[PDB]
Amino acid sequence: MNTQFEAVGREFNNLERRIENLNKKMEDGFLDVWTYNAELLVL
Amino acid sequence: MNTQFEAVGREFNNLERRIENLNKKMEDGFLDVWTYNAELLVL
Amino acid sequence: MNTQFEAVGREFNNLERRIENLNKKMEDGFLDVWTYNAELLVL
Amino acid sequence: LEKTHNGKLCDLDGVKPLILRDCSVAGWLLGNPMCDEFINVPEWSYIVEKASPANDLCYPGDFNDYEELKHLLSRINHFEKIQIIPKSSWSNHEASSGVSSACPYLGKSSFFRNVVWLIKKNSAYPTIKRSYNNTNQEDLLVLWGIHHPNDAAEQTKLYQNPTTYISVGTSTLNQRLVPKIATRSKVNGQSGRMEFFWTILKPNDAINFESNGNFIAPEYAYKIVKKGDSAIMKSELEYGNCNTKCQTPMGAINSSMPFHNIHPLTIGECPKYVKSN
Amino acid sequence: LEKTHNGKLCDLDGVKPLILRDCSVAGWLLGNPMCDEFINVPEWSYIVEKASPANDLCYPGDFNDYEELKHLLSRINHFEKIQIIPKSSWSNHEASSGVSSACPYLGKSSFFRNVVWLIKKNSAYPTIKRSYNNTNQEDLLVLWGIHHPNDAAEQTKLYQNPTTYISVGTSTLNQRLVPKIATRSKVNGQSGRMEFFWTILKPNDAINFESNGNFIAPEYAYKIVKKGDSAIMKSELEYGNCNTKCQTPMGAINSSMPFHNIHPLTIGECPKYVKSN
Amino acid sequence: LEKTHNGKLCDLDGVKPLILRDCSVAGWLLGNPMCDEFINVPEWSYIVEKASPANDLCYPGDFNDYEELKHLLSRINHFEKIQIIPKSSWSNHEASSGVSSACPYLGKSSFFRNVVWLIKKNSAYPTIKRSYNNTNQEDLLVLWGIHHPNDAAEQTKLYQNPTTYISVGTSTLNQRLVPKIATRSKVNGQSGRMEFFWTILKPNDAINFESNGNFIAPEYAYKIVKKGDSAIMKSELEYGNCNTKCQTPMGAINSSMPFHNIHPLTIGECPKYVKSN
Numbered sequence: 002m003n004t005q006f007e008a009v010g011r012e013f014n015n016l017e018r019r020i021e022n023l024n025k026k027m028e029d030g031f032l033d034v035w036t037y038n039a040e041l042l043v044l
Numbered sequence: 045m046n047t048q049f050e051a052v053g054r055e056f057n058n059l060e061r062r063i064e065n066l067n068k069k070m071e072d073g074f075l076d077v078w079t080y081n082a083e084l085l086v087l
Numbered sequence: 088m089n090t091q092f093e094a095v096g097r098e099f100n101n102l103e104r105r106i107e108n109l110n111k112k113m114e115d116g117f118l119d120v121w122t123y124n125a126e127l128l129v130l
Numbered sequence: 131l132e133k134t135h136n137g138k139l140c141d142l143d144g145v146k147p148l149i150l151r152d153c154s155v156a157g158w159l160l161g162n163p164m165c166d167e168f169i170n171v172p173e174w175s176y177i178v179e180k181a182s183p184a185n186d187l188c189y190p191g192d193f194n195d196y197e198e199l200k201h202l203l204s205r206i207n208h209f210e211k212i213q214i215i216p217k218s219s220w221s222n223h224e225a226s227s228g229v230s231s232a233c234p235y236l237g238k239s240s241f242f243r244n245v246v247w248l249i250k251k252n253s254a255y256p257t258i259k260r261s262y263n264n265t266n267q268e269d270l271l272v273l274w275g276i277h278h279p280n281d282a283a284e285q286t287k288l289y290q291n292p293t294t295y296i297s298v299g300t301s302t303l304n305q306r307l308v309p310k311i312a313t314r315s316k317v318n319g320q321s322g323r324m325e326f327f328w329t330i331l332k333p334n335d336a337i338n339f340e341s342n343g344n345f346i347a348p349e350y351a352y353k354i355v356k357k358g359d360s361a362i363m364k365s366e367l368e369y370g371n372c373n374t375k376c377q378t379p380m381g382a383i384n385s386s387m388p389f390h391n392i393h394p395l396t397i398g399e400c401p402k403y404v405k406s407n
Numbered sequence: 408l409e410k411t412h413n414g415k416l417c418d419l420d421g422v423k424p425l426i427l428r429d430c431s432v433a434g435w436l437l438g439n440p441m442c443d444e445f446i447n448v449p450e451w452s453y454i455v456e457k458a459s460p461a462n463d464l465c466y467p468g469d470f471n472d473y474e475e476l477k478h479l480l481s482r483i484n485h486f487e488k489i490q491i492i493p494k495s496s497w498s499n500h501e502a503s504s505g506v507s508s509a510c511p512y513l514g515k516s517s518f519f520r521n522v523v524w525l526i527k528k529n530s531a532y533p534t535i536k537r538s539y540n541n542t543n544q545e546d547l548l549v550l551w552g553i554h555h556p557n558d559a560a561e562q563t564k565l566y567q568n569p570t571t572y573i574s575v576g577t578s579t580l581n582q583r584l585v586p587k588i589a590t591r592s593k594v595n596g597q598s599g600r601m602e603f604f605w606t607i608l609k610p611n612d613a614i615n616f617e618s619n620g621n622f623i624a625p626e627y628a629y630k631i632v633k634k635g636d637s638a639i640m641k642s643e644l645e646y647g648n649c650n651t652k653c654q655t656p657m658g659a660i661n662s663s664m665p666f667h668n669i670h671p672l673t674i675g676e677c678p679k680y681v682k683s684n
Numbered sequence: 685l686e687k688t689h690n691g692k693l694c695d696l697d698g699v700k701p702l703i704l705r706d707c708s709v710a711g712w713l714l715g716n717p718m719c720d721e722f723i724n725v726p727e728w729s730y731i732v733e734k735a736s737p738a739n740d741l742c743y744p745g746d747f748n749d750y751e752e753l754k755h756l757l758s759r760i761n762h763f764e765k766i767q768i769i770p771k772s773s774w775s776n777h778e779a780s781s782g783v784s785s786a787c788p789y790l791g792k793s794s795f796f797r798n799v800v801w802l803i804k805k806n807s808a809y810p811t812i813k814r815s816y817n818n819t820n821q822e823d824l825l826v827l828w829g830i831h832h833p834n835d836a837a838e839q840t841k842l843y844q845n846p847t848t849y850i851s852v853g854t855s856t857l858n859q860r861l862v863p864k865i866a867t868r869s870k871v872n873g874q875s876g877r878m879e880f881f882w883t884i885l886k887p888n889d890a891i892n893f894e895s896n897g898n899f900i901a902p903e904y905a906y907k908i909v910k911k912g913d914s915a916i917m918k919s920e921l922e923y924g925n926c927n928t929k930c931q932t933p934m935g936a937i938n939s940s941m942p943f944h945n946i947h948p949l950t951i952g953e954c955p956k957y958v959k960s961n
């Protein structure tokens with residue numbers, strides 16, 4: 002499991018709100034996946 | 045499985061075609077993952 | 088496993104470095120996931 | 131794995147969605163004359179817009195930063211329209227014949243009803259200076275525009291001054307637009323263009339307009355009165371008179387299952403989406 | 408888990424890829440004189456471009472919205488070049504000495520061959536007005552440019568008029584470029600710059616150019632004749648004369664396995680990629 | 685599943701992070717007078733910036749392409765400040781009273797210390813031409829700016845010339861800024877604005893500035909002396925005097941576990957993050 006998603010901080014301005022949202026839902030997206038993947042490796 | 049990827053609609057103009065494509069392949073990407081994850085939880 | 092993430096080449100200029108990075112960490116992100124998913128299907 | 135939907139658009143917990151019919155978000159907000167159905171709109175749960183709404187920008191042109199505005203629309207549930215510069219107040223510019231056949235109303239030349247297309251008066255177009263202080267509790271969506279003529283003669287006929295500008299300042303916005311005279315193919319009978327711009331004016335801030343030509347002045351802005359979870363859904367369906375707790379572009383879902391099959395872009399308390407068959 | 412490839416670039420189902428050698432997409436489309444190999448190109452399966460192609464923008468400058476054009480190129484399989492403004496037709500502007508040593512051909516000063524660098528004639532540069540109606544069944548890729556001189560004296564020498572513009576209009580495009588005189592370090596012996604622009608002209612639309620200086624006019628545009636699945640692949644490899652059903656930047660794959668190891672960016676019917684060892 | 689952290693910010697392998705306190709990246713780099721703590725900064729492991737740093741842009745305005753600069757900052761570990769145009773050298777422009785109460789230092793009107801706000805002298809503002817050849821081994825971060833006045837009278841008072849420009853050229857940069865006179869609400873007592881721009885000047889390249897008004901000239905640029913892994917962390921915490929191998933915005937981690945619970949945005953050798961409880 003050494004190669005698991007690592008989130009980086011990225012910054013977007015007031016008119017970059019769509020890609021800020023795209024970025025957020027991706028970082029969350031991968032976190033939610035690996036959370037599930039570790040919880041179900043245990044079980 | 046309550047915390048699984050939920051897709052949002054996002055819109056891009058005629059000269060935002062690369063990030064439209066990036067967005068599409070991400071939303072599909074996560075859908076394809078959770079489809080696989082639910083089909084193989086069953087099996 | 089026929090529907091697994093397929094990476095596309097995308098290009099970004101010198102001032103598009105954040106979304107280049109977002110794109111890279113997504114394509115890697117999904118590769119790392121399916122690598123894990125195939126290695127642990129075997130095991 | 132629910133595979134069944136009711137094939138129509140319902141309310142979302144007794145809150146009716148805003149169905150735009152054949153109008154686009156742009157046509158609604160700017161006030162396309164074909165969009166009077168939506169002059170004053172009650173609170174909505176979500177918004178529905180067709181793929182290619184027929185009534186969008188009647189006078190051909192562009193809505194600047196449009197997708198960011200739409201994104202900004204999917205966490206708003208209620209606008210309340212207010213007058214910020216009365217059409218009555220234009221003393222030195224002609225304010226009543228800025229109309230076009232590209233924007234018909236009942237077959238008569240009209241124009242977007244939320245902004246005013248100022249024209250010269252007695253062969254003159256004095257410098258315009260106007261302010262609006264947002265003395266409301268709420269954020270304001272303010273819209274304005276610029277007219278790009280199709281030649282030097284047209285420019286001088288409508289606005290007198292051959293070289294013109296529009297400057298708009300808030301506490302954050304520092305804009306200075308210049309009209310772009312080009313030669314263009316006719317869209318809706320017109321080869322001129324209108325380009326539109328927007329800004330959110332925070333409570334206690336003031337917007338300052340100044341121009342000597344080509345100005346499409348605001349009349350009505352929008353008070354953002356209810357913020358909350360919302361969305362813009364792309365669908366072809368008409369209103370179904372029903373109610374639901376989960377809506378999709380294909381139709382509503384009444385189900386108990388943990389998963390579903392219909393459409394990935396859903397709104398409300400919903401089963402999770404999978405591609406499975 | 409296939410780990411073996413043939414280390415060269417093949418056809419993709421008997422369709423030969425476009426290998427650009429040392430030319431870039433920009434050099435090919437604009438017509439860099441070092442890129443005559445590609446003046447007229449047969450149908451391709453995919454496109455191959457080196458990391459740093461040596462022949463890109465011979466005269467130093469910029470290709471505007473270049474990455475979006477490239478993306479637009481990876482769903483095109485065949486251009487057919489057509490003349491839209493013949494070099495012969497420039498009656499009032501010098502059209503034959505817009506050349507530079509930065510763009511050598513056989514060691515002689517030349518210039519990109521798809522666009523024309525107009526210069527003044529008899530100490531004058533009349534206003535240019537030209538139209539092209541796309542009377543073809545297919546979309547057109549039209550390219551044009553602006554010259555940014557390095558000072559007021561140069562501006563006035565080449566173009567007479569000290570203050571100039573280029574306006575380009577279609578049914579959707581409303582552009583008005585202004586040259587930017589700056590002082591710049593020499594690239595390829597030049598401190599002036601050329602900036603290039605493009606648009607897709609839909610069937611039955613017309614493009615209208617108008618300028619009084621600094622205009623790099625089109626001569627040849629591109630008919631998009633075959634649309635379909637394609638790609639731009641970054642590789643250093645030369646053509647391998649072979650054939651395949653799966654290609655990678657590292658080399659082609661002949662395999663039956665479900666997975667592979669080589670390179671994530673593949674094209675065709677391919678085993679899925681994993682990082683495994 | 686480590687759930688415990690030390691609630692403070694430590695060094696990362698004996699390398700101390702740059703903690704900006706109440707200054708922003710913009711305030712630090714431009715030289716806000718409230719940011720003298722950071723005039724010359726030793727090598728850092730990572731950078732810490734509060735959510736809403738109080739001292740950012742003292743004179744109201746904008747830092748152009750700011751997020752891309754910040755991103756460019758998270759693979760830099762050490763700047764070394766150098767003088768590229770001495771304040772002493774302005775012979776024909778007043779260089780000592782370009783200050784404002786919006787930028788106080790000890791309650792006296794000051795200004796960002798890395799750039800110079802030139803003003804007219806003897807009712808005149810000659811054309812400025814200056815060059816800096818980067819004769820260093822390393823890349824340079826060069827910063828400059830433009831002043832957008834609040835009216836024609838102000839423009840003419842400060843700069844004499846009613847119509848002005850700033851052109852900046854490198855081997856890649858071809859910029860020509862024009863001041864935007866608008867009417868704006870006062871921020872920090874000011875209704876004028878300053879807009880800032882930056883570029884990386886490669887070794888052996890030269891930057892050329894030319895202007896006839898509204899120019900905020902550089903004095904100090906930054907030598908990028910140490911490139912390597914770095915980050916900008918958003919945190920409210922002050923410096924903790926400790927040391928660690930894994931840092932988070934919430935606090936440092938001393939642990940042996942394979943996973944952790946604290947905060948997704950970590951730096952160093954760290955256990956992987958999960959949402960688990």
Ligand SMILES: *[C@@H]1O[C@H](CO)[C@@H](O[C@@H]2O[C@H](CO)[C@@H](O)[C@H](O)[C@H]2NC(C)=O)[C@H](O)[C@H]1NC(C)=O
Binds near residue numbers: 263264334335336
């Ligand atoms: C918009 O109007 C408000 C209200 O008249 C102005 O702010 C008030 O007036 C003065 C500032 O000169 C202060 O003493 C009050 O405290 C303010 N009242 C409130 C309720 O904020 C404000 O200056 C105007 N804004 C702009 C941008 O011009």
Ligand SMILES: *[C@@H]1O[C@H](CO)[C@@H](O[C@@H]2O[C@H](CO)[C@@H](O)[C@H](O)[C@H]2NC(C)=O)[C@H](O)[C@H]1NC(C)=O
Binds near residue numbers: 315316540611612613
């Ligand atoms: C480009 O040329 C076409 C063809 O000549 C023009 O459209 C035709 O001409 C008139 C419009 O005035 C119509 O009655 C025909 O139906 C059109 N024919 C076709 C095949 O479309 C068109 O007007 C020109 N386009 C522009 C943008 O100027």
Ligand SMILES: *[C@@H]1O[C@H](CO)[C@@H](O[C@@H]2O[C@H](CO)[C@@H](O)[C@H](O)[C@H]2NC(C)=O)[C@H](O)[C@H]1NC(C)=O
Binds near residue numbers: 592593817818888889
């Ligand atoms: C910046 O200065 C350098 C060093 O003086 C210039 O390059 C040198 O000078 C000439 C070019 O005219 C060459 O013969 C040398 O080989 C160069 N030396 C080095 C170390 O590169 C350079 O021309 C100047 N750069 C710009 C952009 O004006």
